[PDB]
Amino acid sequence: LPTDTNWFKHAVFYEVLVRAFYDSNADGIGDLRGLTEKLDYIKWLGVDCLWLPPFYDSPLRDGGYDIRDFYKVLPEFGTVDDFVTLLDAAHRRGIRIITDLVMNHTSDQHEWFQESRHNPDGPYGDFYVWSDTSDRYPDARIIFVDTEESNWTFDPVRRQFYWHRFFSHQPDLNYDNPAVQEAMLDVLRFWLDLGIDGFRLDAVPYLFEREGTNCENLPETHAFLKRCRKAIDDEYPGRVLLAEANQWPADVVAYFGDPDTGGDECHMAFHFPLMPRIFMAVRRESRFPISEILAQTPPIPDTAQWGIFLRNHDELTLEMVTDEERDYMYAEYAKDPRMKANVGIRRRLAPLLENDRNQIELFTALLLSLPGSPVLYYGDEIGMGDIIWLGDRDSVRTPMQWTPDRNAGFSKATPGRLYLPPNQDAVYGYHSVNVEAQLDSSSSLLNWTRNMLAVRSRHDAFAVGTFRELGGSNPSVLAYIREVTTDAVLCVNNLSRFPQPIELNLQQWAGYIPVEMTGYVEFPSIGQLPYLLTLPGHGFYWFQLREPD
Amino acid sequence: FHFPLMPRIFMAVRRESRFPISEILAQTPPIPDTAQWGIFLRNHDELTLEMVTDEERDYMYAEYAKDPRMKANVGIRRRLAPLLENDRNQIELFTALLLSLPGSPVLYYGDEIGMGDIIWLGDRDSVRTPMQWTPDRNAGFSKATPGRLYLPPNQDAVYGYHSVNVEAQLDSSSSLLNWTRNMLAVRSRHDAFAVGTFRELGGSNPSVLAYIREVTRQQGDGGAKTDAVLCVNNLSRFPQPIELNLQQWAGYIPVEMTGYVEFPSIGQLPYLLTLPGHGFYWFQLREPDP
Amino acid sequence: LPTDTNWFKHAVFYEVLVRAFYDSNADGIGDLRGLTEKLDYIKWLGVDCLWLPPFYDSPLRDGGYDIRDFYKVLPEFGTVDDFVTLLDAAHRRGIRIITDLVMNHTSDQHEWFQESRHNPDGPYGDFYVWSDTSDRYPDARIIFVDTEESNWTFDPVRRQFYWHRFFSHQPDLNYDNPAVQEAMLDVLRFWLDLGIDGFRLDAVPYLFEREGTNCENLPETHAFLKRCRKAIDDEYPGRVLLAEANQWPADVVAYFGDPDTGGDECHMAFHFPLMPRIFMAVRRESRFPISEILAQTPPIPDTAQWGIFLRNHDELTLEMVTDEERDYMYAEYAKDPRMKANVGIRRRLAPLLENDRNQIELFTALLLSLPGSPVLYYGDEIGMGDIIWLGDRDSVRTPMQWTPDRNAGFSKATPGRLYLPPNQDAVYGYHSVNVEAQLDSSSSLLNWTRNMLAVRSRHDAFAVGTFRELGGSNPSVLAYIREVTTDAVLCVNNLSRFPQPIELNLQQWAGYIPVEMTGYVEFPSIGQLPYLLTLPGHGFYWFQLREPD
Ligand SMILES: [Ca+2]
Ligand SMILES: [Ca+2]
Ligand SMILES: [Cl-]
Ligand SMILES: [Cl-]
Ligand SMILES: [Cl-]
Ligand SMILES: [Cl-]
Ligand SMILES: [Cl-]
Ligand SMILES: [Cl-]
Ligand SMILES: [Cl-]
Ligand SMILES: [Cl-]
Ligand SMILES: [Cl-]
Ligand SMILES: [Cl-]
Ligand SMILES: [Mg+2]
Ligand SMILES: [Mg+2]
C-alpha cells in the first residue's frame, strides 16, 4: 500500500483469530485461506486493519503466546505463502494487517532454547538467562503467582536455573546478548519484508532485568524499542508498532518515546483502564469515572495514538490494570458483583452487558467517539456470547457464527473435530445469533454496527479531533465535542437507565445547526440560552455541528 | 371497541407520520358520560377475522392494500411481536400508545413476554398456543405428553419457549415482562390515562405525536394521581426533535414518570424534546411551588 | 421408456408431494423444478417410480383433491413444460412417474360447474347431477357425516340441488352423460400424450348412482373402467392404472376386471387392511392377524398386482377399511389405545411406532417382502415425524428434511413464507433428523433402507414370487418362502418384543444352504430335522436358499 504515515490514527482495527474465523479445508480449524475467503465480509463491515493474535509455530501451551519458531506459520493455518496471499488480498481491498509478536520470551521447544540447554558453550549458550542460583532479581513479582513457585526454574539437562516472567515453559530471552537483539530485529524485518503493516509488540516491559529494580520498564528496554522504531523509520516507512503495556496511562506514555523527537518508540499503546471506567460509570450512573480517566491522561506525542477497546483484561496475563495510589476507583471494583465474578476471565461485550442491546449500543458509541483508534473484537458486531468453561482466554475464542447451519457455518468437519465448539445456548447459540440472520433487517446489531462505522469514517474529528468535555447540569450524562480544523461533532451519552435531560452551554457554537448523524434531521439552531437535550435510558446522540449560511 | 385504532397506528409508523392517528381520534364522535371505548393492538375482529374499514369515511381505505406486511396478514390474527417483526422499540411504542390513548385497554395473553404465533394452525388458532411459563417440557404449560397438547407451543429460534418464557423474564428489570409490568403500575397511579380529557398538541414535526390528558378535578383531590400528563411519541425510525407550545402550562415542571427526573420548567418559549427512533416519554405535569 | 408390461410388478413406488419436496424458487413452496433437482437422491435411494398426489390447478380446499382444471398445473408448482422436464429427467434415470387423478368430481370452481349452474340449457347443463329435490339415492351414506348434512346441496344460482359424495364444494360429474365420459377419457389421453406412466384413479367406486342401491361399485362404473383400460391397452401399451378402492380385499378384486381376459380394468389396486393387521399382530405378538388377511385374500388376475403400504388410513377419506362381517379383528381396533388415538389421522411410520428403530425395520422388512408392489412414503426412509395439529392429512405433508440448516434445507425463503413448517421438536426436528446427517454412517436408517431396497431388487421372488406361509412351532413368529421358477428366499419375522425360537419344517429344501442376505454368511445346510432359528425381539432375517453343488 502507498505510504501514509497517519493511517493508524484513522483506522478501526478488528481483532480476529486465524483459528476461529473460517475453516476452508474441513480439518475443524480456522486457516489463512479461510480468512482470505471472508475478506469481502470484513470490507463490507467497514474495518480498516486486521489484528491477528500469534499465528506462529507453537505447541500451544499458552494460547500460542509460547512461540516455537518465529519464522514459520503454525502448520494447521497454512504456510508463509498463504500469509502473503492473505496480505495481498487484504491490500487489494484497502485493508491492512498487523500481528502480535511476543518479544520477551519463546517456548522451551524453540530450537534456540534446546541448544542453550544442551550446548552451553555453543552460540546459543547465552541466548537465555541462566544462573547457578535462584536468588537474582528478588524484587520482581511472580506474574502468575498462583501457578509458578518462582521466576527461576531448574533445568535438568543444563543443571542451572533459567529466568521466566511467564510460565516455566516460556524461558526469557537474554537481551544483554547483542546477538539476541540482532536476531529479534531480524524477525521484525522478515515479516516486514513479506509486507505486514505492523506489529503489536507483547511483553516488552519485561525485556531487561537489573538487580535493585522490579525488572520492568528499564531504560535499556526503552533503548531496544528505539532500535525497533528506527529500523521501521529507516527501512519500512508507513508501518506501525503498538505497545502492549498493561499499566496506568501515566506510566504508558513512556512507551511512545522522547517527546522532543515527536516520539521515537511505539506509534501506539493501549489505554487499558477505559473499559473498567466506562463499566463503572454505567453501574453508578455517573460520568465521573470516564471524565476523570480522560482528564488525568497525560498528553502524548502528536504523531502517536492511543488504542482503545471494550475489554477489562489484557489477553496475555488476564490481569486488569489498576493503581493503588492513582486510581480513585481502586477499591470500588470489588464492591461490584459483576466485576467480581469475572476477575481474570475474558468476556465478550454482549455477556459483559447481560445482552442488553441498549447498553451494547452505548458502549460501542463511546468506543467509536472517544479519543483513540478503536479495536473491535470479532463477533461482538453480531452480539456473540462466550463459553467461560473453555478457559480464561478460550472463553472468547469460539468459532465465528456465520449461519444457523451445522457448526455455525464455520466448518464442514464433524463437530467433534472442531478446535473449539460454537455457542449452543438459547441466548447466544448459533441457531439464533449468526451473520446470516442479521444481514437482512436494517435494525439488526450487525447492520447498526456497520452503519456506525460508516458514519464515523465520514468525520475526521472522531479519529484525530480535539476532545472537549462539556460538563453540564446533569452528572448522569457525558457530553463532549470532537473538533478538527471545519469538522465538528457533538456526542451526548446517557449513563443512567432512566430518561435524562441535559442543558449544555453551547454558546461558542451559537448559530450552528446540530444535524443528527443517523437520520440527518436538523435540530433547532444553537442560541445563547442553554441547549436542552433529552435522552432515553442508556441512549446517545451524535450531532454534526453545521456552519450557518 | 374502537377497531380502527391499531390499523391506523400501524400505518402511522409505516408512514412515519402522526396523521393517521390524529385523524381517527379527531373524527371519533363523543360518547355518553357513562360510557368508555375499549382499545387493543389487533387488526382483526376475532369472530369474523375481518379488518374494519369504510370506503366513504376512511381516508386510508386504499392504502392498506399498498403495504406488503398488511397485505400478507389479511384475515389472520397475529400477536404483537410478530406484527412488529420482534422490534423491541416498536413493541414498547405501541404498548405505550395502548396504555395512554383514550379508552380502556385490553392486553392479549402472552404479548407481555413477546410471544410469537403459529400461522399454520389456523386464522384464529395462530394466536391461541399455550402460555409459555418456563423453558421446560411443553413450556411448563402441562405435564402431559406433547402429542396430547390441544395445540403445540412455539419452537423456533426467535419465539420458541426455550428462549421466550415468563421465568426467563422475571429476573432482569430490563426484560419486556418487567417493563410492561412497570408501565401498568405507572398507569394505575395516574387517573388522566383512564378518564382524562384528550388534547392533541400538534407541533412542528409531523413525525411526532404529542398530547396532554387532564382530570376535571372535583372535591378532596390534589396530588400526582390527578395531575395532568404529557405524552410524546416518535413515529419515525430516526431521532427527532419536537418543539411544543405548552404556554398554558407555563411554570409547571414535567417529571418523567419512570425515573422521576425533573425536566426544566415550561416557559413561554417553545419546549424542545428530543426522541430516539420510535421512542416515547410520559411526564407528570407538576404544579409549581409558591 | 421402452415398453415393459410388467414393470409395475417389479417396482418400488415412492409417494412424494410436489409441494413438500424441494422449493427451487424461494417462494416457500415445493415445485416441479425442485423435484427435478432432487432426482439424483431418488435414484440413489433406489426407488423405481414416483407417485405424485394431485398437482392440478385447484383452490386447495380439500388438499388438491378438489380440481379446478384437469389440464393445468397449479401455478405455484410450474407449468406443463416443467412437468415434461421432470418426466424426461426421471426417464433418463430409469424412474417412472404416476399421479393421482380424481375421476368422481371436480371443484365447484371448475369452469364446467360454473357453466352448468349459470347456463343449464347449455352444453354443460348436464355435466353434473341436478335435481328439484334432495330425495334421490337415499340409501347412499354420507361419507363425511360429521360435516355434510346431506349428499345434496341447494345451489343459489341454478336453484336446484346437486349431488356430491364428498364435500359440498366438490360436485359429482354425471357419468350417464356420454360427453362426460369422453371428456374424462380425453383428460387421461392428455397426460398420457405428455408421457406420464400411469394414474391412480381416485374415488372411482362412486362414479354412477342408481335408485335402490348404495351407489357404490355399480356395473356401469366397472364398464367405464373397462373403457379406460381399453384406451390404455390400445393407444399407450406399458402404462398402468391403479385403483383407490378403500374396501375389504374380497370386494376389491372386482376392480381388476374380468378374470377370463386376464384382467380388463385396473392393473393394480391397494390392499388397505395389511397395515392395520400388521400393527395388531405386533401389539398382540401373534402372526395370526397377518396370516389370516393374506390367506383370505382371493386370487387376482396373473397380469395384475396388489399395491401395499404402511398406513392405516386412505388419504382421500381418512377412513380405515373394515368389515363388520368378514373382519375378525373388527371390534379389536377400538380396544387398542394407540389405534384409538389416531382414528381419522394420517401418521408417519416412525410416530406410529413410537420411534422404535427395531419396529421400523420390522415393518419395513414386511413391506418389502410380502406379496405386492410396495409404496414408500417420502421421509419415512429417514424416520421423519409428523405434526398432527396441521390437519388430518397435512399432518404428514411437512417439508422434506434435507439438512439441519434453516427450513431444513427445503427452501431459501423466510420461515414464515413456507407452505407448512418443518418438525422442530427434540425427537423428530430437522436439527436431529435429516438426510445429510444420515448419509455418512452405514448404520443410519437411511442407509439401512437403501440397502434393503438394493437387496430386494436382486431377487425377483419378492416382486412376483409365490407366497408360502410355513406355520411353525411358535405363533409369535411369521415365517414364509417366496419363490419363482431358481430364486427362492426365506423370511422370518419376530412379532414379539422378546427373543423367540422357531423350528421350521424345511424338508422340501433339504440340502439347500441358507445365505443371509445382508452379510452373506452361509448358515448350516437344511436337513431332515426341523431347522431352528432364533430371533431377538422384533427381529427378522432374509435368507437366499441356495442350491447345493
Ligand atoms: Ca526479560
Ligand atoms: Ca358419482
Ligand atoms: Cl489463532
Ligand atoms: Cl511457513
Ligand atoms: Cl489485550
Ligand atoms: Cl474482558
Ligand atoms: Cl375481537
Ligand atoms: Cl390481528
Ligand atoms: Cl402437492
Ligand atoms: Cl400448465
Ligand atoms: Cl391412500
Ligand atoms: Cl395412517
Ligand atoms: Mg482448517
Ligand atoms: Mg417454490
d(CA C435, CA C384): 10
Interatomic CA distance for residues A258 and A279, integer angstroms: 33
Ligand nearest to the CA of A32: 13
The C-alpha atoms of residue C170 and residue C75 are separated, in whole angstroms, by 21
- Amino acid (1-letter code) at residue B240: Q
Q: With contact defined as beta carbons under 8 Å apart, do B112 and B180 qualify?
A: yes
Single-letter residue type at C149: E
Mind spelling out the 3-state secondary structure of C261-318?
HCCCCCCEEECCCHHHHHHHHHHHCCCHHHHHHHHCCCCCCCCCEEEEECCCCCCCCC
At A445, phi and psi to the nearest 5? -60, -40
Same structural domain, C110 and C5: no
A294: Cα within 13 Å, side-chain hemisphere? 21
> What DSSP string runs through A200-248?
EEESGGGS---TTS-SSS-HHHHHHHHHHHHHHHHHSTT-EEEEE--S-
Q: How far is the CA of B46 from the centre of ligand 7 (A)?
A: 4
Is there a contact between A516 and A431 (Cβ–Cβ < 8 Å)? no
Write the CB contacts of C235 (distance below 8 Å, at least 6 apart in sequence).
C189, C192
CA dihedral (B68, B69, B72, B74) positive or negative: negative
Q: Where are the alpha helices (DSSP H) in C129-206?
A: 178-194
Whether A534 and B281 have beta carbons less than 8 Å apart is answered as yes
Task: Answer with the one of A420, A444, A464 that is the final residue of a domain.
Answer: A464
Angstrom distance (rounded) from CA B61 to CA C273: 57
Count, residues in chain B: 290
Judgement on whether residues C304 and C405 belong to the same structural domain of the protein = yes
CA–CA gap between residue B58 and residue B75 (Å, rounded): 19
Catalytic one of C100, C202, C216, C381: C202
Q: Report how far Cα A324 is from the mean position of its chain's Cα atoms.
A: 24
Q: Are B162 and B185 in contact (CB under 8 A)?
A: no
SS3 of A120-188: the string is: CCCCCCCCECEECCCCCCCCCCCCCCCCCCCCEEECCCCCCEEECCCCCCCCEECCCCHHHHHHHHHHH
DSSP β-ladder status, A487-494 and A540-546: antiparallel
Residues within 5 Å of ion ligand 4 by Cβ?
A 72-73, 79-80
Distance (Å, rounded) from C-alpha C494 to C-alpha A404?
43
What letter represents residue A522's amino acid? E
CB within 8 A of A331, min separation 6: which ones?
none
B-chain residues near A524 (CB < 8 A): 241, 243, 272
Q: Which cell numbers hold the place of C271?
A: 390392499
Rounded-to-integer distance, Cα A190 and Cα B11, Å: 63
Residues of C in contact with B146 (CB under 8 A): 425
- Closest by CA position to A491, among listed A539, A547, A530: A539
SS (H, E, C) chain B: CCCCHHHHHHHHHHHCCCHHHHHHHHHCCCCCCCCCCEEECCCCCCCCCCCCCCCCCCCCCCCHHHCHHHHHCCCCCCCHHHHCCCCHHHHHHHHHHHHHCCCEEECCCCHHHCCCCCHHHCCCHHHCCCCCCCCCHHHHCCCCCHHHCCCCCCCCCCCCCCCCCHHHHHCCCCCHHHHHHHHHHHHHCCHHHHHCCCEECCCCCCCEEEEEECCCCCCCCCCHHHCEEEEEEECCCCCEEEEECCHHHCCCEEEECCCCCECCCCCCCCEEEEECCCCEEEEEEECCCC
Q: Where are the alpha helices (DSSP H) in C195-259?
A: 219-235, 249-252
Least Cα distance to A112 among A80, A158, A69 occurs for A69
Q: Is A81 a catalytic residue?
A: no
- Residues A30, A36, A42: CA angle, nearest 5 degrees: 100
Residue C163 main-chain phi, psi, to 5 deg: -90, 140
On chain B, the residues whose CB falls within 8 A of the CB of A427 are 163
CA-to-CA distance for A244 and A307, rounded, in angstroms? 10
Give the whole-angstrom CA distance, residue C162 versus residue C171: 7
Nearest ligand to the CA atom of C271: 11
| CA distances in angstroms from C455 to C190, C448, C451, listed in the order given | 37, 11, 6
Dihedral sign, CA of C59, C62, C68, C72? positive
What are the cell numbers at A103?
518479544
| Residues in CB range of B32: below 8 A, 6 or more apart | none
Measured distance CA(C410)–CA(C230) in Å, rounded = 41
- Amino acid letter at B170? L
Kindly state whether B233 is in contact with chain A, defined as any CB-CB distance less than 8 angstroms. no
**Chain-centroid distance, C-alpha A286:** 25
Write out the H or E segment, with its range, that includes residue A428: none
Strands of the sheet with A513-516, listed across from one edge: A466-469, A477-484, A487-494, A540-546, A513-516
Nine cell digits for residue A476: 448522569
- Residue-range definition of the domain harbouring residue A532: 465-549
Q: How was this structure determined?
A: X-ray
Of the candidates C522, C460, C530, C520, the residue with the CA atom closest to the CA atom of residue C488: C460
For chain C, what is the domain count? 3
Contact B241 A426 (CB under 8 A): no
Asked if residue C469 and residue C375 are part of one domain, the reply reads no
Q: Are residues A359 and A255 in the same domain?
A: yes
CA distance A483 to A491: 11
Q: In this structure, what is the dihedral angle of CA atoms A185, A189, A191, A196, given to the nearest 10 degrees?
A: 110
User: Are residues C470 and C457 located together in one domain of the fold?
Assistant: no
C199/C308 same-domain check: yes
Separation in Å, CA A343 to CA A312, A317, A337, A388, C8 = 9, 12, 10, 12, 72
Closest partner CB to B258 (pick from A354, A427, A499)? A499
Quick check: C351 and C385 in contact, CB under 8 A? Answer: yes
Other CB atoms within a 10 A radius of the CB of residue A299 amount to: 8
Q: Which residues of C93-124 are buried (b: 16+ CB within 10 A; e: fewer)?
A: eebbbbbbbbbbbbbbbbebbebbbeeeeeeb
**Beta strand C531-535 with B280-286: parallel, antiparallel or unpaired?**
unpaired
From residue C262, alpha-carbon distances to B114, B164, C251 in Å are 67, 65, 18
Min CA distance, A404 vs chain B (Å)? 10
Question: How many angstroms separate the CA atoms of C432 and B155, rounded?
Answer: 14
Looking up cell 419515525 gives B236
| Residues forming beta bridges with residue C540, ordered by sequence position | C493
- Half-sphere exposure of residue C317, counting CA atoms within 13 Å on the CB side? 21
C-alpha to C-alpha distance for C512 and C549, rounded to whole angstroms: 9
Both C204 and C309 in one domain: the answer is yes
E strand or H helix at A487, and its extent? strand A487-494
Spell out the residues 6+ positions from residue C382 whose beta carbon is closer than 8 angstroms to its own.
C401, C433, C434, C435, C438, C444, C445, C446
Cβ atoms of residues B97 and B235 within 8 Å = no
The CATH number that applies at residue A131 is: 3.90.400.10
SS3 A256: helix
Cβ neighbours around A430 below 10 Å, total: 29
Q: Which residues, 6 or more positions from B124, have their beta carbon under 8 angstroms from its beta carbon?
A: B46, B49, B77
Q: How far apart are CA B167 and CA C65, in angstroms?
A: 46
Q: How far apart are the first and last CA of chain B?
A: 44
Cross-chain residue pair B239–A516, CB shorter than 8 Å:
yes
What single-letter DSSP state applies at residue A399? P
Q: CA of C114, closest CA in chain B: separation in Å?
A: 26
Question: Distance (Å, rounded) from C-alpha A379 to C-alpha C203?
Answer: 59
Question: Could you say which of C153, C174, C195 is where a domain stops?
Answer: C174
Q: Catalytic: A436? A: no
Partners of B152 on chain C (C-beta within 8 Å) are 387, 389
Q: What is the CATH number of the domain that holds C479?
A: 2.60.40.1180
Neighbours of C197 (CB within 10 A): 24
Query: Which residue numbers of A belong to the known binding site for substrate?
Result: 62, 105, 170, 200, 313-314
CA-based nearest residue to C220, from C206, C233, C232:
C206
Dmax (CA) for chain A in angstroms is 81
Cα–Cα distance for residue pair C106/C144, rounded to 1 Å? 17
Q: Do A299 and A421 fall within a single domain? A: yes
- What is the b/e burial string over A340-370, where b = at least 16 CB atoms within 10 angstroms of the residue's CB? eebeebbbbbbbbbebbbbbbbbbbbbbbbb
CA torsion sign for B9, B10, B13, B15 is negative
DSSP A547: P
Long-range contacts, stretch A469-475, CB < 8 angstroms, 24+ apart: A469/A291, A469/A294, A469/A295, A470/A504, A470/A505, A470/A506, A471/A505, A472/A502, A472/A503, A472/A504, A472/A505, A473/A501, A473/A502, A473/A503, A473/A530, A474/A500, A474/A501, A474/A502, A474/A503, A475/A286, A475/A287, A475/A288
Which residues, in sequence order, are bridge partners of residue A515?
A522, A544
The three-state DSSP-derived secondary structure of C338-391 is HHHHCCCCCCCHHHHCCCCHHHHHHHHHHHHHCCCEEEEECCCCCCCCCCHHHC
Domain CATH for A289:
3.20.20.80
Say which of B152, B156, B160 has its CB closest to residue C389: B152
Q: Does residue C57 sit in helix, strand or coil?
A: strand
Contact (Cβ atoms closer than 8 angstroms) between residue A488 and residue A473:
no
CA distances to C174, C177, C185 from C126, rounded to whole Å, are 7, 7, 17
Are B157 and A518 a contacting pair at CB < 8 A? no
Give the whole-angstrom CA distance, residue A133 versus residue A161: 6
C390 neighbourhood in chain B, CB within 8 Å: 120-121
Phi, psi of C308 (to 5 degrees): -135, 150
Residues 6 or more apart from B104 whose CB is under 8 A from it? B36, B37, B38, B39, B194
d(CA A389, CA A415): 18
Q: Does residue C136 contact residue C71 with C-beta atoms inside 8 Å?
A: no
Rg (CA), chain A: 24
Judged by a CB distance cut-off of 8 A, whether residue C59 touches chain B is: no
Identify the domain boundary among C412, C430, C464. Answer: C464
Alpha carbons B250 and B244: distance in angstroms, whole number: 12
Residues C130 and C236 in one domain: no
Please state, in angstroms and rounded to a whole number, the distance separating the CA atoms of residues A444 and A349: 16
Same domain, A197 and A255: yes
Q: Please give the distance, rounded to the nearest whole angstrom, from the Cα atom of residue B44 to the centre of ligand 8.
A: 4
Is residue C407 left, alpha or beta, with left meaning phi > 0 and alpha meaning psi from -120 to 50? left
CA–CA distance, A261 with A436 (Å, rounded to integer)? 49
Same domain flag for C53 and C114: no
For chain B positions 113-152, those within 8 Å of chain C (CB to CB) are 118-121, 146-147, 151-152
Cα distance between residue A392 and residue A389, in whole Å: 8
Nearest to C428 by CA among C379, C374, C371, C476: C379
- Least CA distance to A441: which residue of chain B? B85
Within this chain, do residues A123 and A229 fall inside the same structural domain, yes or no? no
Angstroms from A447 CA to nearest CA on chain B: 14
In 10 A of CB A146, how many CB atoms?
A: 6
* Lookup result for grid cell 479519543: A371
C-alpha distance from residue A86 to each of A56, A107, A230 (Å): 15, 26, 27
The sign of the CA dihedral A249, A251, A257, A260 is positive
Residue located via cell numbers 409531523: B206
Which cell numbers hold the place of B107?
Answer: 392486553
d(CA B237, CA A519): 8
Check CB contact of B162 with chain A, cutoff 8 Å: yes
By the 10 Å C-beta count (0-12 exposed, 13-18 middle, 19+ buried), A171 is classed as buried
Breaks in chain C, named by the residue before each, with C–N above 2.5 Å?
485
Quote the crossing angle between the two packed helices C357-369 and C274-284, to the nearest 10°. Answer: 140
Amino acid letter, B121: L
> If you ran DSSP here, which 8-state letter would residue A321 be given?
-
Single-letter amino acid, residue C181: Q
Q: Which residues have CB under 8 Å from A248's CB, separation 6+?
A: A273, A321, A322, A323, A326, A327
Instruction: Point out residues after which chain A has a gap (C–N over 2.5 Å).
Output: 485
| Contact indicator for C366, C334 with CB cutoff of 8 Å | no
Torsion of CA A331, A333, A334, A337, to 10 degrees: 150
* Distance spanning both ends of chain A, measured CA to CA: 40
